[model samples]
Target chain A: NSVSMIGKIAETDVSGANFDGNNKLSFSLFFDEKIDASKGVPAIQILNENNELVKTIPLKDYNGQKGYINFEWDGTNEKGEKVPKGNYKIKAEYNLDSHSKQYLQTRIGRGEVESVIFDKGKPMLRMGEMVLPIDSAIEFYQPDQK
Target chain B: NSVSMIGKIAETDVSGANFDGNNKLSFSLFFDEKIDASKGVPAIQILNENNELVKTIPLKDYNGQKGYINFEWDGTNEKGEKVPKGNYKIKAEYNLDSHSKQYLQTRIGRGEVESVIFDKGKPMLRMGEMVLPIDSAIEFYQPDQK
Candidate 1:
């Protein structure tokens, strides 16, 4: 019911990482400061071992400030397909000030979805101590067929 | 105990897509012909819904010339961090010949990891009817801490 929150996110804290068998991979982002959702926020980037960017968690709205932001991976890529299983990275790109001589500032974090769990009859993800509830999460993309 | 084989792969078939609770995401690639593993085998590129390339599964030996090649996503990017939840893509890129007229050939497939499962007590994945096993999967990367 409550969002994930942490203090002083020097680097992005991907405290949560795991998937829901009910058609979703869920995770969370903890920020020490409030995220600006005015422009729909910034997208989260998923990368691979070679530092190649593989996936993206598109920007969305944030109802809270200074806490863990919930996100869910629909398990499809830009072309709308399920990605192969393996390790990857995640980061959020944003520019508090666009004219500050930088394209965007990036907040980074890393982790893996360790396991799956069910809470109160809802398919949830176990990413460390956080039980990522599937109900409140957002869907980035989904193919016409499952 | 068996590898998943598709009828004919005009392009890559990411039929199996999902993750295990034990810190790994898994999937399979089916091919029509024996893949020559020695040369620059086309890498399986994982992309976000925005068509951004996030990770790549390098071409490797398939024990068999053709059939399904298993892969695992540790849920991290090139920087070795867990990826955020969302949709992504998977494809294979090959240079038919180094000096070929075309720059490179890309065969892509689309879908999102649908669900998770277990077979014979081992964690498995479900993307449609295909159930991907973890035993034969290749690891892209592993962080120090699970």
Candidate 2:
């Protein structure tokens, strides 16, 4: 049977609400696996429905602990302007070295598996714009289950 | 300065709502410290406003993990009848052994520190119905801060 998967690279969707300057939108960032502090610094990228990057929030105080972490977005762009009300997607990323150009090995985004393909006898999952190793999947279920 | 404390033995208050047969009340059970598998089995005790015991929910699936765990109450008593609409308190407890009567040493409850006293050259904290060693406190803050 065909299956859909959720993983670190899967993008989480959020609905933007009316901004009142002080009001905020809250959501949980899920980490399927643990990342050690020595590995890198974690951050979240907010993108519009068209998949255009809007803002990047660096998590300086994160201890690299696993599980769901609460996050609040103030509905502002990097230039401090309010964004239009619409659907947005959130993706997780890590930088191995903030001062240097080195980044973490894996890029976190969210999408359902469209299909599985064999690349040189290795299994790969096709999710939107990402073709990832099957091992990267953290959870799987039928599409109807969602 | 005088301090108020929140700890393992501190009772958490919950407001009971009208039960419609299928509705449930939810709350978070907090563990101030870690409990290993070798230590014991954990449970929660629900008490009425009169300080009388109501129900005890054993956490057999708990892995002695720390931090917050979610719990749900159906407003039913031990006999499967709906409880009254009022306030209730929840406390944590641990049993060292399921077969034997040897329980975990600490009895979890919640109360404010009324005073500090010396017992045989040792410091003891006086809480309502509990005289605990000063080391047992997990968090302390001014009452006004709360």
Candidate 3:
């Protein structure tokens, strides 16, 4: 028999504005699998509306575990200047080697698993309007207890 | 000249009902000072409304750092049985040695720093309906940026 568990994953880019009196942009990162810290450190890139790079914040001392990780951006660019008031996107990049990359995957948007359906022997999790394979989930919890 | 900074602290009891369909009680612990992990580990006690002790959860591998630390109570007694649904109080106990105890303090209620007032040479933080000395704050941040 196969087992199905309820969980969540990050799947979209987070947005926030940087303006006077609003100098911080806080968000979270979700990884569906354990990160290989030995290979290289991961980074969160701040991109403008046009998808142009704005700033790259390197994650240091990350223990490589999976689940939700919180972060706060001070709304500063690479040179430490406040960015203009506009929407920005947040995404994670795992600068891992070839073999490590093949085994590790990451997600950005967060959603809860509403139910599970099996296609043949494979388990698929129905999370709101989306469905994903159970193999992509890195953590599980009792939804009612959460 | 005296320096004043905006901050927050924990200072009240947290409560939650733990029953069927709700087997978890999630809360947080706040420390006003950097903990001395070398001396001993701290523990969180669950108490009933009558002030009777219920369960003690020992914090393990807590780095000697201050600020908010999150925790989840499984709504179980020390014997691993589900506790009855009722009100409970959460508090931290630093079971430190004699000398270490003199310098460590913990709080339970969380409040925001609304304004600052100076009395003589000391700075005080006005957090809503509560006022506390700034010296007791372990972390400070720009409240508007939060």
Candidate 4:
């Protein structure tokens, strides 16, 4: 439906933790299914909740695994600053090329925060819970796909 | 039962590449299984084949959902300059306190470059074809477990 699903957390437990101006944050990207290994995709981006533009996370930055692409943020913004504590929204878009030249795009047209779980190792951004860039206009999939 | 039991690749592909004076490369980290959800786990480091230092790839850089963490390297070495193209190995190590109380370290203990695919958007370091990290060297187990 979407290039991939889009997500991010507006708030995190590390809000109170002290970042030594060099503290780094981590996260991963999981594709709904394995990527078409014979080709290439496009750039991906993550923006703060305030509509503040963050840095562009690259696809070349992935491990080329199935159903996911791993990435990390150095706790800085596009201008490179110790980004103050706040919520963020990530937009994962890829231009899947057609046989010859045509390409198509589909954003996370709808959806909301699911549940951002803050745990050990790495925290997760559940958009449904955070309510960042909430979505609407839904439909239940008929099992038969008629 | 490790987190990435799905047979994933160990490294992100950056072949025939060079990190010169200004050109940079970055990536991230992710915990496939976060047993605890309070404090975060320490980020991992990418070491060259010689186990010499490369740089620490942070976790927070990951926008979440795709995986968990990512980072990029600024072509220049710890000093600065283009690292010539060739086969470079990667090793990931993270520290955790809650898991074992003491500083815990997990490495790509046993495994070499499985198959590095460098002709696409991202490099696929296929461990055996699947994306899960295999080679953990666990004993044979019953379906239900002993």
The digit string of per-residue lDDT tens for model 2 on B55-102 reads 778776776565446678888888888877676777766646557866
Worst 10 residues of 2 chain A by lDDT: A6-15
Would you list the C-alpha lDDT of every candidate in the order shown?
A: 0.46, 0.55, 0.57, 0.39
Once all C-alphas are superposed, what RMSD does model 3 give against the true structure?
20.2
Judge the docking of candidate 2 as incorrect, acceptable, medium or high.
incorrect
For candidate 1, write residues A87-137 as lDDT tens digits: 556567643555564323333332123444656656644433354543322
Tens digit of lDDT per residue, candidate 3, span B48-137? 768888888876467576656777788778988777677787777564767655434443544444344555546565544345676666
Model 4 has a DockQ score of 0.02
Stretches of candidate 1 exceeding 4 Å from the true structure: A1-146, B1-23, B38-41, B61-64, B98-146
Which numbered prediction scores highest in lDDT against the true structure? 3
Q: TM-score of every model?
A: 0.30, 0.33, 0.36, 0.29
Residue B115 of candidate 4: its Cα lDDT?
44
Off by over 4 Å in 3: A1-146, B1-6, B10-22, B95-97, B100-107, B111-146
The deviation in Å at residue B143 for candidate 2 is 19
| Backbone clashes in model 3, listed as residue pairs | A10-A108, A10-A109, A11-A108, A11-A109, A12-A109, B10-B109, B11-B109, B12-B109
Q: Write the per-residue lDDT of candidate 1 for residues B1-146, one digit (tens) a residue.
A: 11121111222234223333236666655454446554456567777667777777777645334444566777667777677666566667543455653323333232123333333345444423354553433322121211
All candidates in order of lDDT, best leading: 3, 2, 1, 4
Residues A13-122, candidate 2: write the lDDT tens digits: 22232244456766555454554555676678887778888878886567656545667788888998888777677767654666776654323333445566778978
- CAPRI-style quality class for the chain A–B interface of candidate 3: incorrect
Sliding window of 10 residues with minimal summed lDDT for model 3 chain B: B1-10
Give the true-contact fraction for every prediction, in order: 0.00, 0.00, 0.00, 0.00
Ranking by TM-score: 3, 2, 1, 4
Q: What is the lDDT of residue B38 in candidate 1?
A: 47
